PDB file of C-alpha atoms and ligand atoms in Angstrom:
ATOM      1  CA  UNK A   1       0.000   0.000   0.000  1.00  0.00           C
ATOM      2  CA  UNK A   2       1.039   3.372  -0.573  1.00  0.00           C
ATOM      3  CA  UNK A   3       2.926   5.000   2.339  1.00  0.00           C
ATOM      4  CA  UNK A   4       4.463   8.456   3.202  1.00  0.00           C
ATOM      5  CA  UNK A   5       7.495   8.727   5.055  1.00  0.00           C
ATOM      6  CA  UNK A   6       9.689  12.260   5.947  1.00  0.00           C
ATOM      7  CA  UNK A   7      13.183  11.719   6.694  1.00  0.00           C
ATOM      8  CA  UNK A   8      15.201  14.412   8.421  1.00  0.00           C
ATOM      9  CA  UNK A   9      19.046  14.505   7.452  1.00  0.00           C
ATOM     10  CA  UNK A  10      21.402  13.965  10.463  1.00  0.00           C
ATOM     11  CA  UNK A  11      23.663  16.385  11.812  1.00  0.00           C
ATOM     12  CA  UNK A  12      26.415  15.503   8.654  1.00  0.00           C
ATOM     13  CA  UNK A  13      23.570  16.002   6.101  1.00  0.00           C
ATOM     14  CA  UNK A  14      23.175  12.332   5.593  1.00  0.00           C
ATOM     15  CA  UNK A  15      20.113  10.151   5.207  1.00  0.00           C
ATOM     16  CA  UNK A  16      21.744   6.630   4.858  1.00  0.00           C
ATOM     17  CA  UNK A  17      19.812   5.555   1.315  1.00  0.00           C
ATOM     18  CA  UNK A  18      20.959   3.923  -1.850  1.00  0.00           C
ATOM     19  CA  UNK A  19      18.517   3.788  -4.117  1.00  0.00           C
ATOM     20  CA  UNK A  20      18.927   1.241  -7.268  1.00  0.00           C
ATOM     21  CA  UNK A  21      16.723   2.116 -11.062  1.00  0.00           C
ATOM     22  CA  UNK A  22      15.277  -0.932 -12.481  1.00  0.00           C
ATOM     23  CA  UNK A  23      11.764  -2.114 -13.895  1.00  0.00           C
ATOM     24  CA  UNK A  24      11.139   1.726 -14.909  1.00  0.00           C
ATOM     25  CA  UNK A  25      11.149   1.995 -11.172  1.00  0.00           C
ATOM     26  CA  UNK A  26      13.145   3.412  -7.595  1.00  0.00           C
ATOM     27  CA  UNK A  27      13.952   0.591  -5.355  1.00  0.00           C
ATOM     28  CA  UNK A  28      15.402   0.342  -1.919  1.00  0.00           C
ATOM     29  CA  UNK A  29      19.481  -0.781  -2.484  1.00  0.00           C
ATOM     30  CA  UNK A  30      20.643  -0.259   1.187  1.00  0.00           C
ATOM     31  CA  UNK A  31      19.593   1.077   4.093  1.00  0.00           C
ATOM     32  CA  UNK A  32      22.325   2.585   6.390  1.00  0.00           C
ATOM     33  CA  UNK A  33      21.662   0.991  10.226  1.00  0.00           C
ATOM     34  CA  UNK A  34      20.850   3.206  12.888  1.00  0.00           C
ATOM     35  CA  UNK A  35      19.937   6.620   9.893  1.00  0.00           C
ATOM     36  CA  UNK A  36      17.507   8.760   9.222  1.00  0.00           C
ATOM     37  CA  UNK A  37      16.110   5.797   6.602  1.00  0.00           C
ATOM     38  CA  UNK A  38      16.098   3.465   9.270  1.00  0.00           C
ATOM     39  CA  UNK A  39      14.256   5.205  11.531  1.00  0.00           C
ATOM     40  CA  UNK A  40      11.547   5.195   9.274  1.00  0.00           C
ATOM     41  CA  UNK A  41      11.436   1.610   8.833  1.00  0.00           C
ATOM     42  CA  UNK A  42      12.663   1.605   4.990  1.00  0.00           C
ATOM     43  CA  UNK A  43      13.920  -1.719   4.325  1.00  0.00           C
ATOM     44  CA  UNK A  44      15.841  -3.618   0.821  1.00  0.00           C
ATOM     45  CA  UNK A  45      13.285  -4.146  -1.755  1.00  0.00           C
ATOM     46  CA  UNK A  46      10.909  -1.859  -0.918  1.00  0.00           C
ATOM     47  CA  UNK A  47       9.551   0.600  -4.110  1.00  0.00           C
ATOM     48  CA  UNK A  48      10.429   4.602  -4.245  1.00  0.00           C
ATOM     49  CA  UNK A  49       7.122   5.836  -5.690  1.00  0.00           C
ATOM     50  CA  UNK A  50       7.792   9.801  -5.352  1.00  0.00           C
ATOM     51  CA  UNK A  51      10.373  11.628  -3.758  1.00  0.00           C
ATOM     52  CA  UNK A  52       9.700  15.152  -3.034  1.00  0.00           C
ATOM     53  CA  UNK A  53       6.496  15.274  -5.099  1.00  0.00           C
ATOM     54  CA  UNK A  54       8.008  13.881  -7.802  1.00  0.00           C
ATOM     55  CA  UNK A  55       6.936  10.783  -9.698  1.00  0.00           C
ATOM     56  CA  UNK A  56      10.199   9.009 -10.218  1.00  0.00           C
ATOM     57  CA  UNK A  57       8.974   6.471 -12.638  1.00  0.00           C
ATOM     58  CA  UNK A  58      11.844   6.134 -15.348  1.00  0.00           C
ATOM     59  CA  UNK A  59      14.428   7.781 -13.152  1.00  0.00           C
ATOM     60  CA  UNK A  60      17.659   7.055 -13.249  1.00  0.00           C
ATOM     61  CA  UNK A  61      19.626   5.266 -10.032  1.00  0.00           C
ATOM     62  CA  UNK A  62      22.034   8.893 -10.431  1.00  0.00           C
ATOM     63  CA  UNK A  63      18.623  11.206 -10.735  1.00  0.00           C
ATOM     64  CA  UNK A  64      17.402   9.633  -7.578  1.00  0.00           C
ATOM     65  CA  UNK A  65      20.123  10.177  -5.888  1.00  0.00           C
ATOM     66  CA  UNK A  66      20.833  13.887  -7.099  1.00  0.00           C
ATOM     67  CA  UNK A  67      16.905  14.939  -5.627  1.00  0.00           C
ATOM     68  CA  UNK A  68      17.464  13.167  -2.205  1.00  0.00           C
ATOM     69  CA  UNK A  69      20.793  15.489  -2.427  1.00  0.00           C
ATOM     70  CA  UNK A  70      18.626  18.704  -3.817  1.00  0.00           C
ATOM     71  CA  UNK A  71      16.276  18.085  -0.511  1.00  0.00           C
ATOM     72  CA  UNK A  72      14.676  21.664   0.731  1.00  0.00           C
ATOM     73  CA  UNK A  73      14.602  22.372   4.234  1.00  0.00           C
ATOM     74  CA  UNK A  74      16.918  19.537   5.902  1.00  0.00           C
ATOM     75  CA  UNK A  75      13.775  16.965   4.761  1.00  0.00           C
ATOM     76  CA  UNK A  76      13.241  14.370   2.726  1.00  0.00           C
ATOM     77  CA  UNK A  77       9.997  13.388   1.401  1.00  0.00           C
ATOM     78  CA  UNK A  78       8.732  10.210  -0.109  1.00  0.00           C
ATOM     79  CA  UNK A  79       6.386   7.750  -1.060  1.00  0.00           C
ATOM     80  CA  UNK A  80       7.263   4.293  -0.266  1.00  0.00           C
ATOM     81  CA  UNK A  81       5.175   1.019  -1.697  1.00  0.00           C
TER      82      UNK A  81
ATOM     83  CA  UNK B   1      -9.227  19.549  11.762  1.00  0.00           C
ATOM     84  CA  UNK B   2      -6.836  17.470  13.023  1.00  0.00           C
ATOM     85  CA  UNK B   3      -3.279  17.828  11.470  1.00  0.00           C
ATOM     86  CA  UNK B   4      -0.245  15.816  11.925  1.00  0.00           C
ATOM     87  CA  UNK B   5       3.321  18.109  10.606  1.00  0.00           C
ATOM     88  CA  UNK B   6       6.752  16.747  11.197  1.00  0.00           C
ATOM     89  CA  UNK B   7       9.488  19.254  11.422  1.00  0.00           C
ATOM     90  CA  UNK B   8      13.031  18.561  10.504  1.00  0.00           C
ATOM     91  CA  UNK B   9      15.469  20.522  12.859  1.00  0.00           C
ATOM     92  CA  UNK B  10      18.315  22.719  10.997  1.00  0.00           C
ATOM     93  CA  UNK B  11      21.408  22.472  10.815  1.00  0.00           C
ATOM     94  CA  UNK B  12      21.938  24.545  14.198  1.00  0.00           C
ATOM     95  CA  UNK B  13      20.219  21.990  15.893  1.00  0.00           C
ATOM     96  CA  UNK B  14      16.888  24.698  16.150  1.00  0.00           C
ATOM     97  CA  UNK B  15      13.000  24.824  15.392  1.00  0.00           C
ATOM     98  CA  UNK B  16      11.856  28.600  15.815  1.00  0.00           C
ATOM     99  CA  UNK B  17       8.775  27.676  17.439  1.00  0.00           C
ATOM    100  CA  UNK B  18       7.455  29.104  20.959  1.00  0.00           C
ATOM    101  CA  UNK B  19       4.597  27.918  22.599  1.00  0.00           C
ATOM    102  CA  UNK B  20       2.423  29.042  25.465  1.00  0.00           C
ATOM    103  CA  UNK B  21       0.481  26.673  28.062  1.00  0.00           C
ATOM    104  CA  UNK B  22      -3.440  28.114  28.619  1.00  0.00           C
ATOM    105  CA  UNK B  23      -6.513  27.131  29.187  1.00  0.00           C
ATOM    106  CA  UNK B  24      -5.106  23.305  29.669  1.00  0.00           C
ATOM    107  CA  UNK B  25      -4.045  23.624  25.863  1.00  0.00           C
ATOM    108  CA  UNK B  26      -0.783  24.164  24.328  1.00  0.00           C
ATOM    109  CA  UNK B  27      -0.370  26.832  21.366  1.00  0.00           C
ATOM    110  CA  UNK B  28       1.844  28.261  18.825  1.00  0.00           C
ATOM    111  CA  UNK B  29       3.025  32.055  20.554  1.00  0.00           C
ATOM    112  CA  UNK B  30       6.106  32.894  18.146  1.00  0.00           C
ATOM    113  CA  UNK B  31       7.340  31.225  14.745  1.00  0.00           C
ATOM    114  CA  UNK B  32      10.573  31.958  13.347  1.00  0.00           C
ATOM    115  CA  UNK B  33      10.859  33.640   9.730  1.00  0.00           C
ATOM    116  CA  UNK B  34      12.217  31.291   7.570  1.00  0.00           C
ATOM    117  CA  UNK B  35      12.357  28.056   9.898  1.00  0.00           C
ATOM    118  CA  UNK B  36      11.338  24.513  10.559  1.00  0.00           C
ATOM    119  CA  UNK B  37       8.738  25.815  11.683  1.00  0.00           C
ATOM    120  CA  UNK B  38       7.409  28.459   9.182  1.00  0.00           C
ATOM    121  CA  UNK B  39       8.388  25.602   7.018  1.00  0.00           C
ATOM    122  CA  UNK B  40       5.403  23.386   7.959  1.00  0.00           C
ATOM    123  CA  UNK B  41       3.039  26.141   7.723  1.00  0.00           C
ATOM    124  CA  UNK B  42       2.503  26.672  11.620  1.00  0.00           C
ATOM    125  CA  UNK B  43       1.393  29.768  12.877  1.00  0.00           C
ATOM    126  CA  UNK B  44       0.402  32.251  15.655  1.00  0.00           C
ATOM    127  CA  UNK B  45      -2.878  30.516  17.680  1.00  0.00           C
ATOM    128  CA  UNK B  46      -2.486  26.943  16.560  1.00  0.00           C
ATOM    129  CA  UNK B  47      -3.198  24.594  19.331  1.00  0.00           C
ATOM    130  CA  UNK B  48      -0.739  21.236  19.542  1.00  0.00           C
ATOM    131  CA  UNK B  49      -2.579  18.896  20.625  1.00  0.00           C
ATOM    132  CA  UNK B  50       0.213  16.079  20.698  1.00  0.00           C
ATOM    133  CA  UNK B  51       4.127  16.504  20.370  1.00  0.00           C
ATOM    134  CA  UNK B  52       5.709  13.263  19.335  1.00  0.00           C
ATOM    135  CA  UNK B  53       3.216  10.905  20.121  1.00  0.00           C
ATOM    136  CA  UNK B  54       2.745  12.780  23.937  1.00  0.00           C
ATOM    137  CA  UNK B  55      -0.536  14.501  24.471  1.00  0.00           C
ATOM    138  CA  UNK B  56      -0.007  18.119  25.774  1.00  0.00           C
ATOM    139  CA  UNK B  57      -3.291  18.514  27.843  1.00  0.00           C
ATOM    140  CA  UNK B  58      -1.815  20.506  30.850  1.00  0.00           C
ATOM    141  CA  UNK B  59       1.663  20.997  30.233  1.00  0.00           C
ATOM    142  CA  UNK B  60       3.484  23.648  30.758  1.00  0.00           C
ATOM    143  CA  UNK B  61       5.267  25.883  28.673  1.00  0.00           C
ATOM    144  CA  UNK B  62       8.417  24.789  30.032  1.00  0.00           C
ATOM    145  CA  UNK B  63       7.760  21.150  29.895  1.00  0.00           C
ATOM    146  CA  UNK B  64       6.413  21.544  26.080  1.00  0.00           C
ATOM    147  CA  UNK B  65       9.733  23.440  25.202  1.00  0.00           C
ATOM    148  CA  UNK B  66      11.530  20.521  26.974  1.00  0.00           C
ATOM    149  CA  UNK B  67       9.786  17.813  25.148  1.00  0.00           C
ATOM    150  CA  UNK B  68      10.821  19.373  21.722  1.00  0.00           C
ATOM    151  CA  UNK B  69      13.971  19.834  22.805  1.00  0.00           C
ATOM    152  CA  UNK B  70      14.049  16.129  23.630  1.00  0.00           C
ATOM    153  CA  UNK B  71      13.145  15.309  19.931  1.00  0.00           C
ATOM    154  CA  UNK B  72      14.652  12.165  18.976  1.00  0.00           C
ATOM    155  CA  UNK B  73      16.252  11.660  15.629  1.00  0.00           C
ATOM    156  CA  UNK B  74      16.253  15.388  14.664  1.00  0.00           C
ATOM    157  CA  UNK B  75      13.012  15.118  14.201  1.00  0.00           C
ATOM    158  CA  UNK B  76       9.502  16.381  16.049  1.00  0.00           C
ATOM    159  CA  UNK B  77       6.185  15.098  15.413  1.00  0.00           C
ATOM    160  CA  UNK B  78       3.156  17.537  15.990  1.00  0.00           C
ATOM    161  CA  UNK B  79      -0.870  16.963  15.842  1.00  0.00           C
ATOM    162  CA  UNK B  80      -2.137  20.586  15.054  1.00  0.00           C
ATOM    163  CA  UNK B  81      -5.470  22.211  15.172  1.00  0.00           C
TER     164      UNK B  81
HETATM  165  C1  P1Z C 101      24.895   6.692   7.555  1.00  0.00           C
HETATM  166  C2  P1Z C 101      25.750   6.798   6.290  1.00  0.00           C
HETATM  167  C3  P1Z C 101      25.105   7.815   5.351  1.00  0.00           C
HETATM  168  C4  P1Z C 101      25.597   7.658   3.908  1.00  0.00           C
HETATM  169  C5  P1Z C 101      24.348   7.631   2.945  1.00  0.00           C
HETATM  170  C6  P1Z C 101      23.825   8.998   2.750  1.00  0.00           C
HETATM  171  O1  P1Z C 101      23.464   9.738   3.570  1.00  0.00           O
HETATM  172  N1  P1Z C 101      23.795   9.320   1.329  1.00  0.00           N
HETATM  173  C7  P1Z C 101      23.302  10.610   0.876  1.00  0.00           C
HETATM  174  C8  P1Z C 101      24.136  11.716   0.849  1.00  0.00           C
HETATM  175  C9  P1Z C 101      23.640  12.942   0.436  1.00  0.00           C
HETATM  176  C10 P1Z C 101      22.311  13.072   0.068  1.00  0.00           C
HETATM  177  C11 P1Z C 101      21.470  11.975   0.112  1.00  0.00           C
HETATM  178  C12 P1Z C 101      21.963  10.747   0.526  1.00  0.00           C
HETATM  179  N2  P1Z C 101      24.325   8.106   0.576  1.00  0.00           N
HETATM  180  C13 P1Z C 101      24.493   7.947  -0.866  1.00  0.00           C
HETATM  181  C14 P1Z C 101      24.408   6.684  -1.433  1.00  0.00           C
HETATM  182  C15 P1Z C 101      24.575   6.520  -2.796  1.00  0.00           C
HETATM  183  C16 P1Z C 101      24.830   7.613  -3.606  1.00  0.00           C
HETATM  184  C17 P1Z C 101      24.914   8.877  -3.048  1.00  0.00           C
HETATM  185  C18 P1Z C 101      24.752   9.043  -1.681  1.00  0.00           C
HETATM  186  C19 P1Z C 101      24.673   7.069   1.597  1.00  0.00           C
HETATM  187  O2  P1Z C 101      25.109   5.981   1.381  1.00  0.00           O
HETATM  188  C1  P1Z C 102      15.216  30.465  14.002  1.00  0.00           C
HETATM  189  C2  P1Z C 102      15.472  30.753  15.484  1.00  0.00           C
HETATM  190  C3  P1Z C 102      15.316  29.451  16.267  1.00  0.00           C
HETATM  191  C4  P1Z C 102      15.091  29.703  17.762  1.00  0.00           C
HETATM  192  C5  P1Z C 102      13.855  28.850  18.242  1.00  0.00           C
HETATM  193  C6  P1Z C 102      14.247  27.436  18.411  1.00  0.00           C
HETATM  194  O1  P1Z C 102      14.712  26.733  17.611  1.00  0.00           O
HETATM  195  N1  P1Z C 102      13.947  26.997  19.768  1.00  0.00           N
HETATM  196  C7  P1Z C 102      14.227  25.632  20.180  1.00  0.00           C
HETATM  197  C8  P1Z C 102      15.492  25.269  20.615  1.00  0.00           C
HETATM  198  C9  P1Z C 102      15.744  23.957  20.980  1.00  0.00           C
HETATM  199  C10 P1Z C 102      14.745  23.002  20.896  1.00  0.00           C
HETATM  200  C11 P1Z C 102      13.486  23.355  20.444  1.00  0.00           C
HETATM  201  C12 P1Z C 102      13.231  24.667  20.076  1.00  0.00           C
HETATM  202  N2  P1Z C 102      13.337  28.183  20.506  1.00  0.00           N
HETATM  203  C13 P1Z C 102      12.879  28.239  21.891  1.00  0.00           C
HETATM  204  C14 P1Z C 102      11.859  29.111  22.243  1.00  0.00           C
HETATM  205  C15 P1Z C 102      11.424  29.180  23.554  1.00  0.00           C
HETATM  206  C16 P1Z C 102      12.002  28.382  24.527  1.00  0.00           C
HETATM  207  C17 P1Z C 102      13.020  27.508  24.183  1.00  0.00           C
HETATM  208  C18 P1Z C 102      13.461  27.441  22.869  1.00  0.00           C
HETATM  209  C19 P1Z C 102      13.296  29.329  19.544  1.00  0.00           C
HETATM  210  O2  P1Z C 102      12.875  30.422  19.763  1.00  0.00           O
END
């Protein structure tokens, strides 16, 4: 089901995400243990549906990366499947 | 309406939010220009009604500001009015 989650960046700007393209979609890579991404409960596998508003269908592994960088306001947004 | 806002602390460790205890209610007295917590929309009047998962029903000013000081993970978790 679809799921928001907000992710504040630590104190060294960091989230703890890799993010892997594939299947015209954003999945889960790696999750950094004891981050921002774990916090939320994001976990290998699981599907990046937006981040930041954006529909990231088609994305590439670099583009994902470049808007978690681009994040406003210390925060990252996303929707998680 | 009930509201739930999750505010991402910057990178000086800081909210901009003050809040007064009345009438067994906690509500927004000061928000920062240009903060967290202009960030999320909050402003002057808003009742909080639960800061990070804690109802505020009779605290006090001091032990609200506490509580959001205590925010775990650089992050705090409102319910607004
Ligand atoms: C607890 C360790 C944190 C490192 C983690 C991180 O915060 N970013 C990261 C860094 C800046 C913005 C967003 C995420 N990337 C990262 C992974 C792959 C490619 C690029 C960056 C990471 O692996
Ligand atoms: C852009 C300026 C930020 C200052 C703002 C802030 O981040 N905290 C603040 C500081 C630490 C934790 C939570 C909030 N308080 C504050 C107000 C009244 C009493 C105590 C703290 C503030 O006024």
């Amino acid at each position: 089901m679809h799921r928001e989650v907000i992710l504040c960046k630590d104190q060294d700007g960091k989230i703890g995400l890799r993010l892997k393209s594939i299947d015209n979609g954003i999945f889960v890579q790696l999750v950094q243990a004891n981050s921002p991404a774990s916090l939320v409960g994001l976990r290998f596998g699981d599907q990046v549906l937006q981040i930041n508003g954006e529909n990231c269908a088609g994305w590439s592994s670099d583009k994902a990366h470049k808007v978690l960088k681009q994040a406003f306001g210390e925060k990252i947004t996303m929707t998680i499947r």
